[PDB]
């Protein structure tokens, strides 16, 4: 009967811990398919996941690794290390990347790349700082950054919004009338970005992507994203709003290896998300929906997603405003 769950709180504590050890080893594939680009190199390894990203670097024959991480964290990577008898080979530096000091430069910087890498400014701030201690001749992994956009139809996921702020605020609640906040409550419940699985056969149209590289990335670059955008429209009807994926890809010297899942036919990203529009527009097939996401970092430690979009035949105009702060998990 469909229940809405806050997304980072959703899955149990063996899930969550099952979930990093599929992930992670998705990163040691990635790196061991590419060891050349590990091989006798030096490696700057930035903050978090308990330095486990160094010992696929040590897997892959990394000559010397530099881990930099909290002191809380740096200690058990400091146990890992000893107990792995891996002292030659990584050194962990505790702090952080601009206020600490390595006594060299590095051949490949290595951050993994959970969520709370992608959607956190600082996280990524930081590893771009790292490239101070990056050669020229360096490589960083992850080595971009995809955002997918598609328009999608969904009746069902619209109307939703309306039935909740309707059974709350039009009955009185305990005698008192709450029916004047029924379009702030709507209004509210649209700006909840929604994380769900959906059948792609309610794309409107083929997505366009947009790209960001790590490697050319200057200081400020992420701080603000703008994407625009022009789709032509497969199918009529309703648009709803726009699905977004998230991906980081690795591009070695062998293969470049996407991260959160890979493309070659239709299978599943682990970051995805859709955002309604206020108002539904109305496209034909052969028409052309345009318009321009912004992503900009917020207060609380993630990013605005401002949506705007517009039919070009017939000058209907609708948007949204959304923090990703807290998804929410559909279940249906």
């Known amino acids: 009967a469909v229940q809405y769950f806050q997304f980072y709180g959703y899955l149990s504590q063996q899930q969550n811990m099952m979930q990093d050890y599929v992930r992670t080893g998705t990163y040691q594939r990635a790196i061991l398919q590419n060891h050349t680009d590990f091989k006798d190199k030096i490696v700057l390894d930035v903050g978090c996941g308990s330095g486990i990203l160094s010992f696929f670097a040590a897997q892959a024959g990394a000559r010397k690794i530099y881990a930099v991480e909290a002191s809380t964290m740096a200690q058990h990577a400091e146990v890992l290390v000893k107990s792995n008898n891996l002292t030659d080979r990584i050194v962990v530096i505790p702090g952080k990347v601009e206020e600490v000091s390595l006594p060299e430069q590095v051949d490949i910087i290595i951050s993994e790349p959970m969520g709370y890498m992608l959607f956190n400014e600082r996280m990524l701030e930081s590893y771009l700082h790292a490239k101070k201690y990056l050669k020229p001749s360096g490589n960083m992994f992850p080595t971009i950054g995809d955002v997918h956009l598609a328009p999608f139809t969904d009746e069902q996921l619209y109307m939703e919004q309306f039935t909740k702020a309707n059974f709350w605020y039009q009955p009185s609640f305990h005698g008192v009338d709450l029916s004047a906040l029924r379009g702030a409550a709507?209004?509210?419940?649209?700006?909840?970005?929604?994380?769900?699985?959906?059948?792609?056969?309610?794309?409107?149209?083929?997505?366009?992507?947009?790209?960001?590289?790590?490697?050319?990335?200057?200081?400020?670059?992420?701080?603000?994203?703008?994407?625009?955008?022009?789709?032509?429209?497969?199918?009529?009807?309703?648009?709803?709003?726009?699905?977004?994926?998230?991906?980081?890809?690795?591009?070695?010297?062998?293969?470049?290896?996407?991260?959160?899942?890979?493309?070659?036919?239709?299978?599943?990203?682990?970051?995805?998300?859709?955002?309604?529009?206020?108002?539904?527009?109305?496209?034909?097939?052969?028409?052309?929906?345009?318009?321009?996401?912004?992503?900009?970092?917020?207060?609380?430690?993630?990013?605005?997603?401002?949506?705007?979009?517009?039919?070009?035949?017939?000058?209907?105009?609708?948007?949204?405003?959304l923090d990703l702060k807290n998804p929410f998990f559909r279940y249906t």
């Not at 050319?216 to 709003?241: C, N, Q, T, Y």
């Not at 470049?256 to 539904?280: D, I």
Request: hydrophobic content about 45%; some cysteine.
């Open 186 to 321: 709507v209004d509210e419940y649209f700006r909840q970005p929604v994380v769900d699985t959906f059948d792609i056969r309610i794309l409107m149209a083929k997505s366009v992507k947009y790209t960001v590289n790590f490697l050319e990335a200057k200081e400020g670059d992420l701080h603000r994203i703008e994407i625009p955008f022009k789709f032509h429209m497969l199918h009529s009807g309703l648009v709803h709003g726009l699905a977004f994926w998230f991906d980081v890809a690795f591009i070695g010297s062998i293969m470049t290896v996407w991260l959160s899942t890979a493309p070659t036919e239709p299978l599943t990203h682990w970051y995805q998300v859709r955002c309604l529009f206020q108002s539904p527009l109305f496209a034909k097939a052969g028409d052309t929906l345009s318009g321009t996401c912004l992503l900009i970092a917020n207060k609380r430690q993630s990013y605005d997603i401002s949506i705007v979009a517009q039919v070009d035949q017939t000058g209907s105009k609708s948007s949204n405003l």
